[PDB]
Amino acid sequence: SPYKTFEVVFIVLVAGSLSLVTIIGNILVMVSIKVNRHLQTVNNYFLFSLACADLIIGVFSMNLYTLYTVIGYWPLGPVVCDLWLALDYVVSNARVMNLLIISFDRYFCVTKPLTYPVKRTTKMAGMMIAAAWVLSFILWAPAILFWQFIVGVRTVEDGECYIQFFSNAAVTFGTAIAAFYLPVIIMTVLYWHISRASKADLEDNWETLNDNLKVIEKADNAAQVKDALTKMRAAALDAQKATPPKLEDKSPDSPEMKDFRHGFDILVGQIDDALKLANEGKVKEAQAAAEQLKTTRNAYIQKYLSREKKVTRTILAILLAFIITWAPYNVMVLINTFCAPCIPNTVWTIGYWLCYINSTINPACYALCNATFKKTFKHLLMCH
Template sequence: MSWINTMNNSTAEIPHAAEMCNETCSSQPLSSEFSLGVLVLLAFLMVLLCLVTILGNMLVILAFIMDRNLRHRSNYFFLNLAVSDFAVGVFCMPLYIPYALTGTWHLGRSLCKLWLVMDYLLCTASVFNIVLISYDRFLSVTKAVSYRAQQGIMSSSAIKMVAIWVLAFLLYCPAILLWEHVAGHSVVAVDQCYAEFFDNWYFLLCASTLEFFVPLLLVTYFNVHIFHNIQRRQRRGSVQDCEPPRSSSLSWRFCGLPRPGASSPSSEAEDSVSSLTRSWRPAVVANGPSRTETSSRASQRNFSASFCSRSGSKLQRDKKIAKSLAVIVCVFAICWAPYSLLMIIRGVCQGECIHNSLYEATFWLLWINSSLNPFLYPLCHMRFRMAFLKILCPKKFATLRSGNTPSI
């Protein structure tokens, strides 16, 4: 009877042992797969990526501290993104490098939990900040009037930035902290560090949809609408784009004024305005236009030209915004798509169909996005470039300023 009980117990332990074997085998150290020279090269590249992430995002934060010209509503979203990416380089990457190279977690369960919470929170917040920045650019191009009217309102921006962190925390962190307590046991080995839901593909599919697929669709949607808005404005032509606001009875003319003697169709409104202008004009003018009329026409032409210039510069600025957003969408998709897809596939096949080195490569590709963000976002704007130049090369910045360089 005791022999039968022993056999039953050993049989009951087989699935659990197999599960632990799968987890241990799926997280084999890179030292068992590569030579010493390759490991040294990998360690160097990991440390280099960590330093680039820290320094790049620190530069963005210092620019906000030193340059007050950057402190307006939309740029605070860049600061929020830089803070999350900076924390990735300071905390997440350095703790993961020894674990990735040796395959063993030496820092204990408590620090493992903290590292998991911070890693998932910061990466998710980075993605949500990208969506928020794209949405802000979308409003600035498609709804420019209402957007400029709210430029001085900081309360709504602060609420949006806080909401980013709250949503990022709720997506993964409760599951990281409470999963093993709800399940009644832990499936993670003592010397390993990964989330309890690592092989639960149902949860991974839902979380990846909210973390990657939905943000990707939103960012793509905003970018496409920005392109359509710019194309629509270009098709309307420069005459309609340069039309000044109709704030007075003399502002009915378009920017493209006809040449003297050239005939052009006129509407009933134009005829009525022109007749009203003729009836108001003094009758003493016999030999030519008066000085008042001449100065009025000159000021009107100057106003129209300046309005055309402002409209053209805004269109060019919107084109640059659209191009930068297109690059952002592509880089974001390239960095996040492999990891999100492999994470779901790995969960379905319980880690048996995805090689560990391939999964590690996609994991680091995800972090590369945090290294590229300081170059993709702030460097697309003249204000940030001048602030960076002021920090890195103060003498050159002073020379440019003294040389009547256009203000930022």
């Protein structure tokens, strides 16, 4: 039987690799926020707590579950079984309410801009996170650990490990409705209002200009510099014809409006000098002109102030990773209410693992797309 043994060795290697990636990625996120004040924002406070729950899953949950499935029974004991189940459900519930905190916090940012942002401090974020973990502990830990003493009998036999009050399939489905399906519905509606709020024009032009300027600086070939030059110039002219939030609400004849347009005119002049040199065969010189563009952009930036499009995308990525990795297990619970043989044990294990995988892919949804996280990662990994 060489194939069965190879399956066991393959599973141990894959599970150990998944656990290790989950641990390293989330420790990198947590340490980066703690050592970089530029990363110490309210958003990253929520992401810090989310990385903390993901780290616990990678350290405790994945390894204990791998030991459970590989050995074929629970080898540690009833106490360690109860602690593992309680830790798993408390951490998972804290994750769900953490995503609800991120979704509601973003909702009040886009719907109450005159009131909520001033109430959005680090102390408020810490209290919300602390309340989420305490509520999760109170909801799940006493029932999981002490239900056997409430009914006066432990029905979990030796070598088994499962939540005792989940012996009724309808109870498990009710848990799936209250703890997974309703929160997912709330976050979906909340995100729906988020993307509808983001769906004003001035930020959409200035963000395009800065983005294409970065693309010019870090371009690999001659096509990227051309496309970014043209699209930045189009966004530059659209941002030129419009009026910024100028002070004193001055007329177009004002010295503030005239010099505002003049800065964009000089910007287009350097843009066309860069485009010319790019067509002469001096594509490297067009990149040097982008630095001069950056200089001119910094010489007349006092007239302007939005990365919030990236923030909305980041939230959607975190929400989709949660929904997609946790939905299979929860539909197995739904089918389990009326057909237990319809879900084999191997399928249950896969659904359980996909939920764990949520913690593995979580850091890649926000950390691997943020310039400050990337630079802090590089600093943490470079030899001093």
